[PDB]
Curated annotation (Swiss-Prot), chains A, B, C, D, E:
Tree of life domain: Eukaryota
Post-translational modification (record): (Microbial infection) Proteolytically cleaved by S.flexneri OspD3 within the RIP homotypic interaction motif (RHIM), leading to its degradation and inhibition of necroptosis. Cleavage is crucial for limiting TNF-induced apoptosis, necroptosis and inflammatory response. Cleavage abolishes NF-kappa-B activation and enhances the interaction of TRADD with FADD. Proteolytically cleaved by CASP6 during intrinsic apoptosis.
UniProt motif RIP homotypic interaction motif (RHIM): location: 4-20
Domain comment in the entry: The RIP homotypic interaction motif (RHIM) mediates interaction with the RHIM motif of RIPK1. Both motifs form a hetero-amyloid serpentine fold, stabilized by hydrophobic packing and featuring an unusual Cys-Ser ladder of alternating Ser (from RIPK1) and Cys (from RIPK3).
Cellular compartments annotated: Cytoplasm; Cell membrane
Disease: Immunodeficiency 57 with autoinflammation: An autosomal recessive primary immunodeficiency characterized by lymphopenia and recurrent viral, bacterial, and fungal infections. Patients exhibit early-onset inflammatory bowel disease involving the upper and lower gastrointestinal tract, and develop progressive polyarthritis. Autoinflammation with episodic fever and lymphadenopathy: An autosomal dominant immunologic disorder characterized by early onset of recurrent episodes of unexplained fever, lymphadenopathy, hepatosplenomegaly, and increased levels of inflammatory cytokines and chemokines in patient serum.
Family assignment from sequence similarity: Belongs to the protein kinase superfamily. TKL Ser/Thr protein kinase family.
UniProt-recorded name of the protein: Receptor-interacting serine/threonine-protein kinase 1
The protein's assembly and partners: Homodimer. Interacts (via RIP homotypic interaction motif) with RIPK3 (via RIP homotypic interaction motif); this interaction induces RIPK1 phosphorylation and formation of a RIPK1-RIPK3 necroptosis-inducing complex. Upon TNF-induced necrosis, the RIPK1-RIPK3 dimer further interacts with PGAM5 and MLKL; the formation of this complex leads to PGAM5 phosphorylation and increase in PGAM5 phosphatase activity. Interacts (via the death domain) with TNFRSF6 (via the death domain) and TRADD (via the death domain). Is recruited by TRADD to TNFRSF1A in a TNF-dependent process. (Microbial infection) Interacts with mumps virus protein SH; this interaction inhibits downstream NF-kappa-B pathway activation.
From-to range in the entire protein, with total length: 528 to 551 of 671
Function: Serine-threonine kinase which is a key regulator of TNF-mediated apoptosis, necroptosis and inflammatory pathways. Exhibits kinase activity-dependent functions that regulate cell death and kinase-independent scaffold functions regulating inflammatory signaling and cell survival. Has kinase-independent scaffold functions: upon binding of TNF to TNFR1, RIPK1 is recruited to the TNF-R1 signaling complex (TNF-RSC also known as complex I) where it acts as a scaffold protein promoting cell survival, in part, by activating the canonical NF-kappa-B pathway.
Length: 24, 24, 24, 24, 24
């Protein structure tokens, strides 16, 4: 019974074995 | 019974082995 | 029983081995 | 039993080995 | 048993090895 809610965000990854790089 | 909800967002990836790069 | 819902978003990728670049 | 629903969005890619570039 | 539904959107690509560029 898990529920996710996202508002006004940037850079969402939903899955496995993903790669993300965030730069200033 | 997982549920995802996204509003007014940018850059959504749903899957595996994805790559994402975010720059300021 | 997974369900995804997206509203008023930009840049959605649904799949594997995708590449995404986000610039400010 | 996966279900995807998208409303009023821009730039949707559904598949593998896709490339996406988002600019401000 | 995957099902995709899209409403009132812009710029949909369904396939592999696609390229998409989004400008502000």
């Amino acid at each position: 019974s898990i529920k996710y809610t996202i508002y006004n965000s940037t850079g969402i990854q939903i899955g496995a074995y993903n790669y993300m790089e965030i730069g200033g």
